[PDB]
Design a protein around this nucleic acid. Structure first.
Ligand code: MG
Ligand code: MG
Lengths: 122, 106, 127, 197, 167, 61
RNA sequence: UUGGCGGAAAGGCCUUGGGUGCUUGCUGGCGAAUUGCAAUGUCAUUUUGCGUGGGGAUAAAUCAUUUGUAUACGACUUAGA
RNA sequence: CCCUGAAAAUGGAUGGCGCUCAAGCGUGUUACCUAUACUCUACCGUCAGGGUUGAUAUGAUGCCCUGACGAGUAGGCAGGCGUGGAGGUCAGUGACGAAGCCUAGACCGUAAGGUCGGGUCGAACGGCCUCUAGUGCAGAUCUUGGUGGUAGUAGCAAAUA
RNA sequence: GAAUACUGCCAGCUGGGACUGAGGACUGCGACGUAAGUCAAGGAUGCUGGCAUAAUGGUUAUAUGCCGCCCGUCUUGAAAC
RNA sequence: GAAAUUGUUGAAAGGGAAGGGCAUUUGAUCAGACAUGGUGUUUUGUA
């Protein structure tokens, strides 16, 4: 959601040109971050390996109003509120190893070739 | 020795086509060495293998084969028509392909 | 275990979809014939979708047969299952979708006793 | 039959060579064309200069930068004539065109390799004696190519080095032919002569 | 009921096939295959190797041998459509090949349970090979370079056109 | 393409197997189609065709 | 390993010396089977990662501050241990 | 045959590249390429002509043999698929989960459609023979309701601060 | 006095290649045979190998070759500026 | 608790649209057949 916004030098960190400072959004998001850190210390987490594993924002129901336009017309003036959720997890070690067995199917010609190689070399 | 080739090299040129409609069921093969239908009549009925490679190993190998045969001659210049069990993937236009000497009449 | 049959051939294994069902969401992909006066699909221009017709019909020795070689017969209980007692090599039972699990075990036991093939012997099974 | 085929472009006709080479690339043969400044076009120099001026008139009116590009080098003229005969707007056409590189002169990757000719595109074999023809280097430097003389100087240096190579090669092959003639008329030579070698 | 019934059931009795008219006449081999001919194996494990042809077997197969002392090809049977009959001819009179037949080569077919997860020769076969090859090599020693020819492999070089080559 | 001299796929236009659903009439036409097939008398074919007829084509006698 | 030559896109060509392996130039000895009558029957080069153990070297850019030879904003030109 | 005669407006078209003892023009001889056309075969349907009530087992609107044919707007006719409700039947399915909904999972039909598996869910619903109709939507600047791109855009600059 | 070309005929012989195998007890027309019988005579059988699993195949996404203009409507004519 | 429309995650493609038809490569995913009656008892729970 960035069309026709201004350009700035502080997007060089992220390789973009269009960046902003949405102060109200930052206030709400950092309040939720503080609440999640409080929930994590209440649950008894390490509080130093935490990274934000999940976050999403989607749309709440709109809040409406009306606009007075020329020649006596009415239009809408609607707020688009947000539902925000986020999950912080501890950063763990490497996940897993030891993949599937991968049972092999070989024809008689392939088996004879492998046996011939094993005989013919050491 | 240093050479072990028991086949004849060929090139997969195109499908059988009109000016604007192609037919993937019949492929056109340029066998090297032959420049006339009378010399191309030797190669009728011979097996053709298109041999290619893949990343995923399937049954002990990373090399997959598509089999077919020569059916008839095409044109005046020794191009032949070839039919395969599954048709050639059309990105192989200009790819090398192998014409084996069996079933032999000599 | 089925009756011997010729090789099953489908003349058109692809599903006939309505023109522009990919284009618009209001157009479902159930087949409707184009009755428009300028329709390229109705006029059968080259490069457009094909239409269903009687020439695609399956062989009468091959029609209504499953790839196993039987015809599907829907069953709801043991009395419906018992109708296929003398016709095991031509029909295969299929338990209806609305049968409970404690009845499904009974139908599977009776079908295994009678030698009847069940095409869905895994519905509502707990493990 | 070959991995890379190096074609000496001297004395060849542009369209006939391009129609040979385009079919070779579409069949999958790798082609490099050297000495592109010595191609020939049938017709008067004034006719072909008028043809290039008629081509040079054509450009997009509202912005000349997006119009047809009029390339001036002889190799790029040959590339234009060949891209006309390859269906270049498809992936098959792009994959064909990336099997080709065309040069003025003979660069150092290819000055030590073997050059071939195409006899069905050679000017002395195709044109009637008496018809007039052009040189592509002369036409190209008439329409704006800047590097006609530096290519001539580099080609003079390369020809001097190649003649120095060929003198040693001729002396060595005369020694080998002398030894083969003196080691002939032995029993193995007569048996090979009976068997055809 | 979920489905009602079929009004007629098809009969489950399988019919008999009609009496065929496809008798088996024996194979008519091509004219270049006479016993004693040097063949080139086109396919198989020993492809590109030159062997000698001895006897036409019952299942349209050709009995061949290397000899085993020359190029290591044992007594074997090959398909006639997978060889090239060269013009080089040796005489195989003096070899008793009537012992071999289709039952002489039996694979002793393997059950489905015996799966080779990771991983021998008949003594009758090995002295039969030793009997026949010493009779072949005496005929090989007459004309020169045949032992070297049979030991060397066949391969196509650059510029070899098989429609123009004579074997 | 065929230059057709007639209308393709046209019905014969003569009514067989009568449109009534009377079971006794169907039994009667079964009996008389057997008789018309095998007794090689023209009477059976005539009455078999007359059994198919509609009400206005069967006036009272 | 010695000596040259090559700048058009040189990145390659030639040469001196010794080592080492093979030699089908010629004559011998042993081996090969069973992949079962064919199944590309697998031998190439392209990029990356992770291990070893052996060398090699110890930076800048951007934001922020500043400038006004620049400038709608970006960008540009300056300065700052 | 070629040339002069022969002048129009964006840059330009033997289709393009290009072609000069042609890849041009006139003419002749062969070989070759391929249409849903022709020949043969298989399968689907339609139409026509026939055979077959004998016993056992069913369906005589059934089964079987033979031949020909298949374009289609306006329009006509036939055979079928689907929906709400009604009579009959399956002593049908179901809280051990009915209906509904989701499912680049499976099967059947040329198709309208039908069936199954998994998830969600919570109280009724289905097959067959018939009856009945407020019975099938992509459009009508259709009706009601909901939602997009535009778009974090136009803009939120009169009345001295 | 011949040959050969050209055209035409053979119920003359013969080699290679491709696609198809419908039907499902018997009945028919024939052929070779003194006969038993046999056969290429009203539609494919015989022998062998590999695998028995995602290998063939189905579905779906992508890539490639060629093709494919937006539907409905009025209209002689619609992709229509 | 459907669709339009949206967020996150996952997979995939993308040089002036996208979407479709025939065919195949590649990746992912998936159904079916695989017992059969059988000489036979090399047999246990002895049939
Ligand atoms: Mg206002
Ligand atoms: Mg849709």
């Amino acid at each position: 959601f960035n069309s026709s916004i201004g350009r700035t030098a502080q997007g060089k960190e992220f390789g973009v040109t269009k960046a902003r400072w949405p102060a109200k959004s930052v206030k709400f998001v950092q309040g939720l971050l503080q609440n999640a850190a409080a929930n994590a210390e209440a649950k008894g987490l390490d509080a130093t390996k935490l990274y934000v594993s999940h976050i999403q924002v989607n749309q709440a129901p709109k809040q409406r109003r009306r606009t007075y336009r020329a020649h006596g017309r009415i239009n809408k003036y609607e707020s688009s509120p947000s539902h925000i959720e986020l999950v912080v997890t501890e950063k763990e070690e490497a996940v897993a190893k030891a993949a599937e067995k991968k049972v092999v199917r070989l024809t008689s010609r392939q088996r004879g070739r492998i046996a011939a190689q094993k005989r013919i070399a050491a | 020795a240093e050479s072990h080739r028991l086949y004849v090299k060929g090139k997969h040129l195109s499908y059988q086509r009109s000016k604007r409609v192609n037919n993937p069921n019949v492929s056109l093969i340029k066998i090297e060495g032959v420049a006339t239908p009378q010399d191309a009549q030797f190669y009728l009925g011979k097996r053709i293998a298109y041999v290619y490679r893949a990343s995923k190993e399937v049954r002990g190998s990373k090399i997959r084969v598509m089999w077919g045969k020569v059916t008839r001659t095409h044109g005046n210049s020794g191009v032949v028509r070839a039919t395969f069990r599954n048709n050639l993937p059309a990105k192989t236009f200009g790819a090398s392909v192998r014409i084996f000497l069996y079933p032999s009449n000599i | 275990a089925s009756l011997p049959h010729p090789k099953i051939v489908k003349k058109h294994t692809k599903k006939f979809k309505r023109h522009h069902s990919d284009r618009y969401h209001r157009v479902a992909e159930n087949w409707r014939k184009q009755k428009g006066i300028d329709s390229v699909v109705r006029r059968r221009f080259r490069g457009n979708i094909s239409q269903p017709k009687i020439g695609y019909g399956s062989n009468k020795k091959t029609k209504f047969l499953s790839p196993s070689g039987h015809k599907t017969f829907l069953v709801a209980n043991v009395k419906d299952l018992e109708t296929l007692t003398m016709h095991t090599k031509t029909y295969a039972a299929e338990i209806a979708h609305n049968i409970s699990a404690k009845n499904r075990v009974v139908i599977l036991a009776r079908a295994k006793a009678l030698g009847i093939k069940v095409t869905n012997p895994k519905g509502r099974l707990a493990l | 039959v070959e991995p890379v085929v190096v074609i000496d472009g001297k004395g060849h006709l542009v369209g006939r060579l391009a129609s040979v080479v385009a079919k070779q690339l579409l069949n999958g043969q790798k082609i490099v064309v050297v000495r592109a400044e010595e191609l020939n076009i049938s017709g008067e120099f004034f006719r072909n200069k008028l043809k290039y001026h008629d081509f040079l008139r054509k450009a997009t009116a509202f912005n000349k930068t997006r119009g047809p590009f009029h390339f001036r080098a002889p190799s790029r003229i040959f590339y234009k004539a060949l891209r006309g005969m390859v269906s270049h707007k498809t992936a098959r056409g792009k994959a064909a065109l990336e099997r080709l590189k065309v040069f003025e002169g003979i660069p150092p990757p290819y000055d030590k390799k073997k050059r071939v000719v195409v006899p069905q595109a050679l000017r002395v074999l195709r044109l009637k004696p008496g018809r007039k023809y052009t040189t592509l280097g002369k036409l190209s430097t008439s329409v704006g190519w800047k590097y006609e003389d530096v290519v001539a100087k580099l080609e003079a240096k390369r020809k001097v080095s190649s003649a120095e190579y060929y003198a040693k090669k001729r002396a060595f092959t005369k020694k080998v032919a002398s030894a083969n003639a003196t080691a002939a008329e032995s029993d193995v030579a007569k048996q090979l002569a009976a068997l055809g070698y | 009921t979920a489905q009602q019934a079929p009004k007629w059931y098809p009969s489950e009795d399988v019919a008999a096939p009609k009496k065929t008219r496809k008798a088996v006449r024996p194979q008519k081999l091509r004219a270049s295959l006479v016993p004693g001919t040097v063949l080139i194996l086109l396919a198989g494990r020993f492809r590109g190797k030159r062997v000698v042809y001895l006897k036409h077997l019952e299942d349209n197969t050709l009995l061949v041998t290397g000899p085993f002392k020359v190029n290591g090809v044992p007594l074997r049977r090959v398909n006639a459509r997978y060889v090239i009959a060269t013009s080089t001819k040796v005489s195989v009179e003096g070899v008793n090949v009537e012992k071999f037949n289709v039952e002489y080569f039996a694979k002793e077919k393997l059950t489905k349970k015996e799966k080779k997860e990771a991983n021998e020769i008949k003594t009758e076969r090995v002295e039969d090979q030793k009997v026949v090859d010493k009779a072949l090599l005496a005929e090989i020693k007459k004309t020169p370079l045949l032992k070297q020819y049979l030991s060397a492999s066949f391969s196509l070089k650059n510029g070899d056109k098989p429609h123009l080559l004579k074997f | 393409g065929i230059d057709h001299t007639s209308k393709q796929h046209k019905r014969s236009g003569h009514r067989t197997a009568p449109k009534s659903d009377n079971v006794y009439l169907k039994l009667l036409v079964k009996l008389y189609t057997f008789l018309a097939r095998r007794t090689d008398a023209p009477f059976n074919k005539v009455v078999l065709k007359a059994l198919f007829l509609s009400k206005i084509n069967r006036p009272p006698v």
